[PDB]
Swiss-Prot record, chains A, B:
Parent sequence residues shown: 15 to 244 of 565
Entry domain remark: The BAR domain mediates dimerization and interaction with membranes enriched in phosphatidylinositides.
Job of this protein: Promotes cell motility and migration, probably via its interaction with the cell membrane and with podosome proteins that mediate interaction with the cytoskeleton. Modulates membrane curvature and mediates membrane tubulation. Plays a role in podosome formation. Inhibits phagocytosis.
Gene that specifies this protein: BIN2
Protein name stated in the entry: Bridging integrator 2
Protein location: Cytoplasm; Cell projection, Podosome membrane; Cytoplasm, Cell cortex; Cell projection, Phagocytic cup
Phenotype when changing F7A: Strongly reduces binding to membranes
Superkingdom classification of source: Eukaryota
Summary of subunit composition and partner proteins: Homodimer. Interacts with BIN1. Interacts with ARHGEF6 (via SH3 domain), ARHGEF7 (via SH3 domain), SH3GL1, SH3GL2 and SH3GL3. Identified in a complex with ARHGEF6 and GIT2.
Amino acid sequence: KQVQKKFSRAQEKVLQKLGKAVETKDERFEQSASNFYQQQAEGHKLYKDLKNFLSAVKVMHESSKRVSETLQEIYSSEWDGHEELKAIVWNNDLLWEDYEEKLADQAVRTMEIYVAQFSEIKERIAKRGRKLVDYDSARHHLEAVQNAKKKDEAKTAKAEEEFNKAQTVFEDLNQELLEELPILYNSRIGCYVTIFQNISNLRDVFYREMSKLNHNLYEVMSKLERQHSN
Amino acid sequence: KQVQKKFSRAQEKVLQKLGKAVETKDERFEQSASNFYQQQAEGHKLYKDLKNFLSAVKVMHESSKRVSETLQEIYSSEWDGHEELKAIVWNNDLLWEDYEEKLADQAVRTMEIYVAQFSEIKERIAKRGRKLVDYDSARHHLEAVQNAKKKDEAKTAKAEEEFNKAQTVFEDLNQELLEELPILYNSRIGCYVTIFQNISNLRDVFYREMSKLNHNLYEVMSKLERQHSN
């Protein structure tokens, strides 16, 4: 009977689009569903941006590694600062890798988890939609049975029970989503706070640690210059 | 007569390759020319690496801009910190642009100027090479004229003057390059010192200024969180 319900639903929907049947107005919930889709779209966009940010960090890392490798190739082992340069180059690579792993774990993964939560809510919104069409389909059938020339009390009674069942199942989903949607909508704030405080914390460590190695790099060049001074 | 000299040079070179004529040995200068080509190759490689580093910085900048633009789109103007966020996003973009312009000017351009200096020295090395082949060509001609059955005093005298002229012009170029090449070779040290002290100075400003905006970003999120706190 799950198959036949799907046929009566689709028939009700097409009769509504053809101006042959009236639908239950649902403009208030549609505004709520619109906010939900906007929130999910925003979330998906930030998620793709964060993956692109992580990919750009890896590009920055590799180009920095390329410069440091050529510098090590051209830096003679006869020169002062050669051993210190190796430590700078190794630790630079370690900071980039640590930063990439922590970005993936604290920012990209956190965003993936937030975005993945919308899937079950979207399925419930879709189900609520189907139950509302079931209700209008049950009203249309009830009105046709009641308006028939040949009165059939048993057909009337079945149409009336289907009406009642469709109202209750729709209202269960409607009550659940009207409670969940504003709480989910408000939770986007906490999501943005977490993501950007995590990025901020990780970059502060990154700047402080990179500044130390960067200062050592200047000192390596000072040692090289002094060794060859007249 | 500049055309005929080029023919006698190429004829001398091919007779040497065919084991039919002896060349002046020039193994010591060849070792010096090898050091010069290695230095130029190293310089060109670092130069391409620095252009790639600047291109990676622009990639990092754009991805950072992409994240900041989405954050500004999703950050309601109803929220505390909205105006401060705009200033962070604008100043972040300004720091990246300033860093890219200074890298191009202080590191990439400095390296371009160093690499461009090798062109005139390479032309002088090539010329010295040609003058050495002119000298061996003048020796081969002199020996053939002197070994002839029919003694020709006027042909002998011309071959002897060509010998003298070829020796002097070769030695002028040889003296010039033996003086220039070790000084140029030693100057690679000063080049590396300048490039990496410039990169170091620019990144220190970059880290300090970015750390300030990055700290403000955490504070924007704290303001957003407090506004929506229970």
